[PDB]
Amino acid sequence: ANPLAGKPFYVDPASAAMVAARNANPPNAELTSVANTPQSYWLDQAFPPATVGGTVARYTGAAQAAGAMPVLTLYGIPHRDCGSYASGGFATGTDYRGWIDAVASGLGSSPATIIVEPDALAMADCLSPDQRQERFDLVRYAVDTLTRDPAAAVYVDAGHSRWLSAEAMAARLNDVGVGRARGFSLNVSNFYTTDEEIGYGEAISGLTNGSHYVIDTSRNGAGPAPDAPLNWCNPSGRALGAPPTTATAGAHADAYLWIKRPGESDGTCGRGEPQAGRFVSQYAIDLAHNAGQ
């Protein structure tokens, strides 16, 4: 059955959006709307192996106390973002493996939804063949280790419908053992329509023995900006998409989620915009305004 049905997704009471919504004077409807929508909590190399277990146990335990499903995004892969606007990640594969062990220690047997490494499989071609195989081994390590929590619903990130082909991405998912996980994620931090991503997801599902998937609908209410380089990097005219739900329109779509947090910058984007991940109230307000809120 769908592991994501049956309780609400957790609203992070300390998100940057919630801090902005509480500080707004006077109160701002757009920030309040975004703040009260469940998103995902992103972890990276800022949370070292030595302590990330406690961070994860705290978050999953808080979600359980709220009667809710936490969604965690792991974004620590070595050579993260191929050294671009969201550069980061752990220095070596050894470090990353230790990090994954620690995350799993903190999960225990607790309910969680885990989005494994946005962009890692899709962007792997920037790496040399040996670095690419290393990366695939690290993603496989994450799948094999994280799924030891029976209550973790694990989705390996698989890019989007305008990145790799369904066949190319299914090959990579099969190589990292997607069969052991619940499935894969699409559209993370991007803007493609839900309908387009369902078609792509169903294709990949067919090529991975019926795996299930989630779609990031955080910013896809108006579809993508016109085809141009960097059209994914803080584009204007985008809108919040469908709020998180398991009432989806795809046979193997477990949920629409907000994986990317609306309002966070995608990067400097060749325009001196805020560093990747920094919350910008104006960005959240514009996304909500464009959705008619």
Ligand SMILES: CO[C@@H]1O[C@H](CO)[C@@H](O[C@@H]2O[C@H](CO)[C@@H](S[C@@H]3O[C@H](CO)[C@@H](O[C@@H]4O[C@H](CO)[C@@H](O)[C@H](O)[C@H]4O)[C@H](O)[C@H]3O)[C@H](O)[C@H]2O)[C@H](O)[C@H]1O
């Ligand atoms: C001169 O060299 C050529 O440059 C052009 C333009 O840069 C290259 O073409 C672009 O190739 C891309 C494949 O690498 C694709 S798909 C496009 O890929 C980028 C990554 O390169 C993706 O960006 C990432 O998007 C994520 C969100 O979905 C972010 O989280 C992440 O930080 C981004 O880096 C993007 O989503 C994909 O759509 C282009 O369509 C193409 O224009 C060309 O290959 C070079 O030879």
